[PDB]
Design an enzyme around this catalytic site. Sequence first.
Site, PDB file in Angstrom:
ATOM      1  N   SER A   1       4.608   7.777  -6.279  1.00 47.35           N
ATOM      2  CA  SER A   1       5.319   7.905  -7.544  1.00 47.35           C
ATOM      3  C   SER A   1       4.732   7.068  -8.669  1.00 47.35           C
ATOM      4  CB  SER A   1       6.779   7.521  -7.351  1.00 47.35           C
ATOM      5  OG  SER A   1       7.337   8.224  -6.258  1.00 47.35           O
ATOM      6  N   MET A   2       5.526   6.146  -9.213  1.00 49.65           N
ATOM      7  CA  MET A   2       5.030   5.274 -10.274  1.00 49.65           C
ATOM      8  C   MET A   2       3.782   4.508  -9.876  1.00 49.65           C
ATOM      9  SD  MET A   2       6.718   6.219 -12.400  1.00 49.65           S
ATOM     10  CE  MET A   2       6.068   5.186 -13.701  1.00 49.65           C
TER      11      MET A   2
ATOM     12  N   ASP B   1       4.742  18.334  -3.136  1.00 48.79           N
ATOM     13  CA  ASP B   1       5.142  17.062  -2.560  1.00 48.79           C
ATOM     14  C   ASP B   1       4.389  16.913  -1.252  1.00 48.79           C
ATOM     15  OD1 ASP B   1       6.276  15.029  -1.066  1.00 48.79           O
ATOM     16  OD2 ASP B   1       8.321  15.510  -1.641  1.00 48.79           O
TER      17      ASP B   1
ATOM     18  N   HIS C   1       3.499  12.900  -6.860  1.00 43.68           N
ATOM     19  CA  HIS C   1       4.810  13.531  -6.932  1.00 43.68           C
ATOM     20  C   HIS C   1       5.934  12.527  -7.117  1.00 43.68           C
ATOM     21  CE1 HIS C   1       8.561  15.284  -5.605  1.00 43.68           C
ATOM     22  NE2 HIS C   1       8.039  16.481  -5.805  1.00 43.68           N
TER      23      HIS C   1
ATOM     24  N   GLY D   1       9.473   3.517  -7.621  1.00 42.41           N
ATOM     25  CA  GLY D   1      10.263   2.614  -8.424  1.00 42.41           C
ATOM     26  C   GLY D   1      10.858   3.311  -9.627  1.00 42.41           C
TER      27      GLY D   1
END
Lengths: 159, 168, 167, 160, 171, 160, 162
Positions: free
Chosen positions: B87-88, B146, B112, B58
């Site tokens: 992510s977030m 990643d 990542h 996001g």
Amino acid sequence: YDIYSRLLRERIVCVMGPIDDSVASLVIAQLLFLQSESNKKPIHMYINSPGGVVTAGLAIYDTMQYILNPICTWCVGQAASMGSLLLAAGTPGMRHSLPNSRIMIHQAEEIMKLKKQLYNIYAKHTKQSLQVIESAMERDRYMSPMEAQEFGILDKVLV
Amino acid sequence: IPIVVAYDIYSRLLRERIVCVMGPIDDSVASLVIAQLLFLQSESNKKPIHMYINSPGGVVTAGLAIYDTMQYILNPICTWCVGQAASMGSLLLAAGTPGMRHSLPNSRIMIHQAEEIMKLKKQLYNIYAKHTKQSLQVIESAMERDRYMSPMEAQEFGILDKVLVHPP
Amino acid sequence: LIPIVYDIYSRLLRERIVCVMGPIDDSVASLVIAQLLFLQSESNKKPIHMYINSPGGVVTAGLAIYDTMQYILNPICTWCVGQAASMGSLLLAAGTPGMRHSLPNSRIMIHQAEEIMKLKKQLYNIYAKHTKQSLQVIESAMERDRYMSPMEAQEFGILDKVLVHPP
Amino acid sequence: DIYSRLLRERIVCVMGPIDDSVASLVIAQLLFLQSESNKKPIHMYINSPGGVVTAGLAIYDTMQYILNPICTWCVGQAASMGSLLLAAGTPGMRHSLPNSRIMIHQAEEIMKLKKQLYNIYAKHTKQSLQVIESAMERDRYMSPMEAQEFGILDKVLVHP
Amino acid sequence: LIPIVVERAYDIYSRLLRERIVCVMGPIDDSVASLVIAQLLFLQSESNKKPIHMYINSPGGVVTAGLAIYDTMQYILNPICTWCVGQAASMGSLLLAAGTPGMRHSLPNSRIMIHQAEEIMKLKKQLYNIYAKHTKQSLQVIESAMERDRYMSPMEAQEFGILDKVLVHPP
Amino acid sequence: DIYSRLLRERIVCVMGPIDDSVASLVIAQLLFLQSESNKKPIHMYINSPGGVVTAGLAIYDTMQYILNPICTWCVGQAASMGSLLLAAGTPGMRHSLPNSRIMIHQAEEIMKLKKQLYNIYAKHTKQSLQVIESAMERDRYMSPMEAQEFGILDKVLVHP
Amino acid sequence: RAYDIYSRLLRERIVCVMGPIDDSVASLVIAQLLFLQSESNKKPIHMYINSPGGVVTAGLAIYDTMQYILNPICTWCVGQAASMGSLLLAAGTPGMRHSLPNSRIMIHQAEEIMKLKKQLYNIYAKHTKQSLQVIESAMERDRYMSPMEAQEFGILDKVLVH
């Protein structure tokens, strides 16, 4: 009461149509709510899934295994790859399917790793070894529920 | 969408103090989750909240908004991971009350992710370090890589506190 | 959608918590000003909290919100959440002096015919009346397009206090 | 809802193309009405241009699972899986109004899929396998009177 | 979506109608004309004397819809209290000036403009005459000024005659 | 709701195209009104440019099975299938407004379906099948007065 | 918001015909018209017109219903009345067709188009008292008429300059 809500009162959770993140949200929400409604009573789940996202279907498989209710899974119509996992993850002995059902197991590097996890979880629940399932995942075929009862996914084909 | 009697199913779970954060983290999800938390904290200063994550990522500023409010709320916060916290999501996952960031065995986790993005990344670094106890260059190396991680492996990095193979 | 029984925002509105989230357009300007004029109708001395999370917006809609905020006698606590960009910073600045708050990680940013340059003088003028900095100071700040941290917002007068945990 | 007020009188309206969405509603109404009672029948109104094959089967085995007698009324068009559902009604209680039209017509799983439809048609219409195999192959809408000698309907109704 | 404040629960706009407030906000349309016209007719039935407040924030719109609102404003016998907030451009300026004299208002910081099939001319000739009636300006001043494309400060609009008071506080 | 307020008064509005969606609702409303009273008149208002033949046939079939007197009121235009519905009002109470616009004009299977349309008009308009052949061929809307002599209407009313 | 204030306006017998006349608007308008007649066979009905015309066969459905009803119908033109909408404006009870001081009115809009054109002329001729020759000539012209031009034409009776 929507009929889906009336059914939920009898602890029947539908999974129908392709499993996406939204269907998972509703199914997880109902399941968690049904656990807090009772940590004892069974839950019935109806599977008619043509497919699903691996990470979405893995979230539901996790939630079912990590919940203390007995989960009875019913195959109505078809349980494609992600649905067949969820069917085979219902509590052992209570995985029913209707006579004309259709089951199919077959589906970068992280996908292979997640696919490796699927091999392992399928082996546990169907009680085949790894190599048996390695071949049976490879064959892109549907199977009838009578063969699935022998393969080990279902318990009783109900007519 | 199911009804339960008239609460929506989510409105019922909010009574059980459960906040569903699913889907991309956007301004609407943040606006809704921030508002949900403000309500829940007004019902109690002490009762643990449960936040359930399945999110692909996001907006960076959106995840920071939930992170900020998670810190400001006085209540304990169980943060459960179903499916994936990318992510977030991994920041919200890390942000729970340390010691009780629970998770489910088949989850997948991924930290990542002009100069505004660079300065902002140096903020993400500091907040990951405070919750995961790791060193800054270690985070920069891991953040730079990643690849998904497992909940066993996630607990070795410190993001998760307890994988549950079943309810205890 | 929204948790309902009387959704959460109506529920938050009841406690004089007025969200402005998402970009500021005429549609949200219409709603936010209506809430304010209602909240002034039920009680005039009591606080109102405005939560700002905006990436920006149309200048004339924010100005409508701005002078509406000025018009009411209520003390308006502003809370900056994630973003107060462009008009959001001006709405954030509009609070009663002393009570413009931020969370510790929000990004604040003031960068933005003949009317637009005249509109910018008004923006220069109104930032100055609220931040107490000089006029050429504000023209120097907004000419450069950068986000600035809440610690800097205290020294520029946009905030008064960043709150990690309540006092 | 006029639709929900027809559910109080045990009427299920399978109208429009059959899909997993239509299947979810239909099987759910059926399971609910069985839980209400196991004696009084379910009245099924079929009007369907076509259908997903596995969706229609999901209705049929739900049809055959329940203990209720199922009165099946064709109105308008009962085609493809709609003809399976039309045949799927309990024997002795398959109805139509006289202007309706009916059509039975419709990768190894496709071959096995078409094969399992043959067996179910043969069970209820009692016509032999070769008769049904040829008939499904014929791309032709049948009149109700032709469907009645073929056995799909018990009764074609003129002014009941 | 609209905050549903409970009392039966009204929308925030339905709550403001109780206070005799009509929010004409957004581009003027045939649908907004219908909505606004219906509210005005209902408000007169609500009271034959008590005032009606109109909050105007309109970037403009179809002239034949703006005139339909303005015509009921003239017809309605109740006093009308026109407040500019944000902007009142093109047809919204006509409604801003359509309130009773001495009661048309503007927030300190609004931006106002009077500049806007040969009916386009005959109707434009109509607009000048109604602007002449309500702003007390002569026809020639309006003709030359309306052709100038420029938003006006509330002070300039005050001296043009459109509005009667620009304030900072209710007093 | 206004449409359901009319249903309280026994009014059924076939407004707009006669599609599978609207045929399902009108059939359902008709079955309801047969249950409310077994004798009282049911009023139908038609403004239909047309629709799919098999859906209009489902509406016509039900209108014939419903015992009650059906008053068909043409309000606007009755084109294609709407005129069959209009002609299927119980004889003696098919009506139209003075300025209404009426139009009867419309592979092997379409031929078979269209041969059905002929007789159902024929037995309701009391015309020879060759006459229905020629008057269903011409693409031309006809006035209520012209339709009365053809056999679709019974009264062309200006006030009640 | 839209459809409950209008429900209130139905209470005092005001039928809003606004927007392009389509069969859905026409079918709802006639549904209101029959309903209002069912409430009382003698009391007036108020009709508010602001329509940039619409579909002729449904506007005739609206027009036919208006001539059908027993209650007198009063048409209040606001804004603009075009084409088929002007037919509703003419069709109110003679003596009850009004307009605001600055509305705008326009009467301009296969063998079916030709026949439809002829019967519209008769309706205008019956209610406006012109000759069919006048209506032919006046219907060709595209120009909007002022309200005062419409009163002298005979479409309307009185203008609410007051």
